[PDB]
Design a protein around this nucleic acid. Structure first.
Ligand SMILES: [Ca+2]
Ligand SMILES: [Ca+2]
Length: 314
DNA sequence: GGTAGACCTGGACG
DNA sequence: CGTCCAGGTCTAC
């Protein structure tokens, strides 16, 4: 039909492909794993969400990643639009080459990698990434997803509606910095996180120089970027690392959360060697981060994603 | 300076 | 149904 979310079978002519073996990408292991919180499997094996300011539905077969876009006459995605998808999934980065390397220097990684191929990093928009992860504080993926959807619904531009779902773009800095935003977000259930969204939005616009200040962090060094980000209210070391890794092109950034701590102890028998505390603390977290970096290398954050995703899936 | 507590909430559990 | 818990951060002491 011409209504509702499309499927590969229902509207054949409206889909376009991008060569992509499942060994290079597994949507089911990437989209709902806590990187981006804006994708939903509206139909089995079909994922819909906003990508580059438009709604898309994605699904894959072996060797093929099928894409369809909802923009005025319905038509298959164009090469340019398709290029946007390629960039979002950073398809130039060869996952098979990275898995090989990680697996050669880390026998445990090699074991896990066998059962969880295709986990890669999405290249996300800084603003959406920053505010989504500010909401990740003491939160679970499902709840975070709820907060984010409600936030975009209330402050983001309306795009299109499919079935009973209305998609919204992520709110702008100006909108998030608006009056009474905190109060409205508190009614949407963000709790104390509402304060940080409002505060960080205003902080960026009225103190750091605006959007430009955030985006240029992509050209800065990880050390630089991570330090700058921690300036913002509600942004600690973990949130800052998520942003560096997922939005600021810092493939060496390694988010250290409770899950990674358990993995370090259980699968590597790791313990702090210079930090005072025995459990998670700013000293030990930093230490654990350096540990994974010295173990996996320049793309340690991407290695972290495979194990984090595999650990979720279990 | 390293570190317990407060700061919000829904889907869980014994 | 009281206590947990999930991609934490902030800061007084
Ligand atoms: Ca936690
Ligand atoms: Ca801060």
């Amino acid at each position: 039909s011409e209504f509702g979310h499309r499927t590969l079978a229902s509207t054949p002519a409206l889909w376009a492909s991008i060569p992509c073996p499942r060994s290079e990408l597994r949507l089911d292991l990437v989209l709902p794993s806590g990187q981006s919180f804006r994708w939903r499997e509206q139909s089995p094996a079909h994922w819909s969400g906003v990508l580059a300011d438009q709604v898309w539905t994605l699904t894959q077969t072996e060797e093929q990643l099928h894409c369809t876009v909802y923009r005025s006459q319905a038509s298959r995605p164009t090469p340019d639009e398709l290029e946007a998808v390629r960039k979002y999934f950073q398809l130039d980065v060869t996952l098979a080459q990275l898995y090989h390397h990680w697996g050669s220097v880390d026998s445990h990684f090699q074991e896990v990698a066998q059962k969880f191929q295709g986990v890669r990093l999405l290249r996300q928009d800084p603003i959406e990434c920053l505010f989504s992860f500010i909401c990740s504080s003491c939160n679970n993926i499902a709840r975070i997803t709820g907060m984010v959807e409600r936030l975009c619904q209330a402050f983001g531009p309306r795009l299109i509606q499919l079935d009973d779902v209305t998609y919204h773009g992520f709110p702008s800095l100006q909108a998030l910095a608006g009056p009474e935003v905190e109060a409205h977000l508190r009614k949407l259930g963000l709790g104390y996180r509402a304060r940080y969204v409002s505060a960080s939005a205003r902080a960026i616009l009225e103190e750091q120089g605006g959007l430009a200040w955030l985006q240029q962090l992509r050209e800065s060094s990880y050390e630089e970027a991570h330090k700058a980000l921690c300036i913002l209210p509600g942004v600690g070391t973990q949130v800052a690392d998520c942003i560096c890794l997922m939005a600021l092109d810092k493939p060496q950034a390694v988010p250290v959360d409770v899950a990674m701590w358990h993995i370090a102890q259980r699968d590597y028998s790791w313990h702090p060697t210079t930090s005072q505390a025995k459990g998670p603390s700013p000293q030990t977290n930093k230490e654990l981060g350096n540990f994974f970096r010295s173990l996996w290398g320049p793309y340690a954050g991407w290695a972290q994603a495979v194990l984090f995703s595999a650990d979720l899936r279990q």
